[PDB]
Design a protein around this nucleic acid. Structure first.
Ligand SMILES: [Cl-]
Ligand SMILES: [Cl-]
Lengths: 95, 78, 103, 97, 97, 83, 105, 93
DNA sequence: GCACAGGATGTATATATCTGACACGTGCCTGGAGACTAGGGAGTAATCCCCTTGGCGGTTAAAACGCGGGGGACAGCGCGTACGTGC
DNA sequence: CGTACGCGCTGTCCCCCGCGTTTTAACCGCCAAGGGGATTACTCCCTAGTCTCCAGGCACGTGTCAGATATATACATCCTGTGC
């Protein structure tokens, strides 16, 4: 019985991080999963062209970054770059 | 078949649409409109099925079609 | 993991796989699955935020598609982002044009 | 007694914008879908989710459309939507030519 | 003396500008504008003269497309004169913001 | 040297000329400012993006290509300048 | 013949279309018929367009195809016009079309 | 340095189709754009089709169905025929 | 009350001329051709079971249809003025 | 500077909305059957990778004619004038 993946459990964990005493329906869960994949493509895609445009073979956090700045509206971009630059530095801390 | 899209159904959609008053000729116009819509979406959909060598049009063919057409839909395996 | 090592809830592994396999480029940096998983995590938070709010406002403990729609269409910045997305079972915001109202 | 022409209209608008349930009953719609697809390929099957997907996409679209239609009506100092509005809406959307 | 009636030179001018392809905004003003806006995003930027020329090509196309659809909105309203509200309806419908 | 009020370079006869190629013949006086309004939101969009490409390419010069890529991005693809 | 173009009896460089599809991250691997097919479809269209442009050039009494000629070509053809329905041609101009209600009676 | 272009192939085809007819620098440029645009559009949508079908390779079957989504009717039909012809031609030779 | 010459208004057009861009020929190099291997993708065939279709009959809401009159569309008119034209 | 259009008013006629009752088929629940899609193991064709080999394709340079420019002239019409 095939082992189909999703983002479901992580959506949940983040839900708890923001609204601890709140739950979700399957129907809305699909929407959250759709949302994630759509956003993932759009950012990944932009990043991809960015590389090409600049005759370079690698999609780095930087490519991802500027992708985000083209894909997102002023404020939402702003925070996104934060969380982005943060988790990266915090990652490069640990090893 | 097409006329299966009932006047009252079309009326409800326009209500959710914010519309107060509806001309008679609208109903039929709506139908051509809706038809064109499905056609294009189902043409693209089927093309995905034809290419997937399946006799069963999936949700993902639909979903891929709506993307193609810039009418992205969430909640059927994005 | 690496979700840990970056304080993320979002699968930093999963993401690194998907970038390599989804044909975006020849090679794929170490920071990017982290940068992106984060941005993904960030944005799913903002939605879950305002939807939950909306479910409180609409007096329910569980979020249904509507609560997402309300959260989205009412947010000026999110609505743009999902400017071309129809959300299943979203409905519409209530909006009735003036001149249509009684006198 | 009798409610003044247009007052249940306003009341109905309120009711439908508050709800998220689909407004075309499934089976006529479903039969319309199969008909249209048959014209593209014979002996075909649809996933029930594949039909819902179409249904959602279509309604959502039509509602959006009435919204924009309705604005054109209003632009013409009118209060009744008419096919000439839809044509203008779509024209400007760049759907129709 | 002599005096062409109102609307007579408009029709002429339309036909003039619909035969040709040469840019309608003056070259220098245009550039000053673009250099401004860009400064206010990041200072210390230079431009390939062809890069300005691109943005202008893209600019006029848009506005002419725009006026086209504005014009339709004027006509929708049994009017012949275009008005900010017309433009405004075109942009709402195009789904611009 | 400082740059100020340049949108008023977009003179009224030009905003006119465009409207004519646009098939409009009768122009309301309140149109000219709305057009400048629009042209601005337009240029602010293409250049925000053009620039983001220029910043990514780590450059101080904005190229015909950064522009063209931006337009493509905004669904206003343009032929004639590379790409 | 050596040129894969000739093997396919095509004007378009099938070697180029092949390199591009790889240096382009569309998939791991590329078939060998896909370049060919694509290189040909590219040709059909440049031909289909150049045809109508030349005719446009001709009516305008001209030896040389300039973008107005491509523009006239494109927006006069229902179908090409839709393929390029979101595209701008530098120096195109627009189609002469004046609305009815603006014409004198 | 080398700036590649479809300038020769476009000339070739123009000469085949309107032999007493030349193209301007700008016109060429435009043409040159059009080829590239339709290249990506096709190539991209083919790439999606490989992906959607858990498939590692873009074969002309992909490039074909890609074409059936991208192009309008008469254009699509002809292009398809034109295409599958040169493949057939290519196999044999 | 209208229409057609009177006139000068702009566009059309004919001309030659002067220019610079295209179109070509030459030669130099890089990207494709050629030939070979080794490896894994995909195609094919062989089994499975899940999902789709189908057909049937009960209440039950929704579609239909008509009736009657109200208010909105639309057409006519007139006023006031803004926008086109010209210098 | 004034003309002809935006719009505000009116006035009529009918096309929609409301509402009560009469007519259809949407829906739900229940079971039944086989199509097709999903999964598995196998072999071989096809494509990536690698090397050596050379003309297709590029830049570079140069010669000329299509087209832009300048100015003269023929063709079209629109509105103002004058008279019956
Ligand atoms: Cl990285
Ligand atoms: Cl192939």
């Amino acid at each position: 019985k095939t082992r189909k993946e999703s983002y479901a459990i992580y959506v949940y964990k983040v839900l708890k991080q923001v609204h601890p005493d709140t739950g979700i329906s399957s129907k809305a869960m699909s929407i959250m999963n759709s949302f994630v994949n759509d956003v993932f493509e759009r950012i990944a895609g932009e990043a991809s062209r960015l590389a090409h445009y600049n005759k370079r073979s690698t999609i780095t956090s930087r490519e991802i970054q500027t992708a985000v700045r083209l894909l997102l509206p002023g404020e939402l971009a702003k925070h996104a770059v934060s969380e982005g630059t943060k988790a990266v530095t915090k990652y490069t801390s640990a090893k | 078949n097409i006329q299966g899209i009932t006047k009252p159904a079309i009326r409800r959609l326009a209500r959710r649409g914010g519309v107060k008053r509806i001309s008679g000729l609208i109903y039929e116009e709506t139908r051509g409109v809706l038809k064109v819509f499905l056609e294009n979406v189902i043409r693209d959909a089927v093309t995905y099925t034809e290419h997937a060598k399946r006799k069963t049009v999936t949700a993902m063919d639909v979903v891929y079609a709506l993307k193609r057409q810039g009418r992205t839909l969430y909640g059927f395996g994005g | 993991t690496r979700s840990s090592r970056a304080g993320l809830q979002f699968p930093v592994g999963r993401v690194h796989r998907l970038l390599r396999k989804g044909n975006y480029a020849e090679r794929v940096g170490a920071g990017a699955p982290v940068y992106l998983a984060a941005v993904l995590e960030y944005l799913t938070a903002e939605i879950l935020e305002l939807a939950g709010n909306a479910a409180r406002d609409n007096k329910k403990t569980r979020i249904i598609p509507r609560h997402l729609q309300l959260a989205v269409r009412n947010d000026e910045e999110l609505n743009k982002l999902l400017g071309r997305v129809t959300i299943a079972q979203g409905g519409v915001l209530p909006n009735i044009q003036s001149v249509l109202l009684p006198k | 007694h009798r409610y003044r022409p247009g007052t249940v209209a306003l009341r109905e608008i309120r009711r439908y914008q508050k709800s998220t349930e689909l407004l075309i009953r499934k089976l006529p719609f479903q039969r319309l879908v199969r008909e249209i697809a048959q014209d593209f390929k014979t002996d075909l099957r649809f996933q029930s989710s594949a039909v819902m997907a179409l249904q959602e996409a279509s309604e959502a679209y039509l509602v959006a459309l009435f919204e924009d239609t309705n604005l054109c009506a209003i632009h013409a100092k009118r209060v009744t939507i008419m096919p000439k509005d839809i044509q203008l809406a779509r024209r400007i959307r760049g759907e129709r030519a």
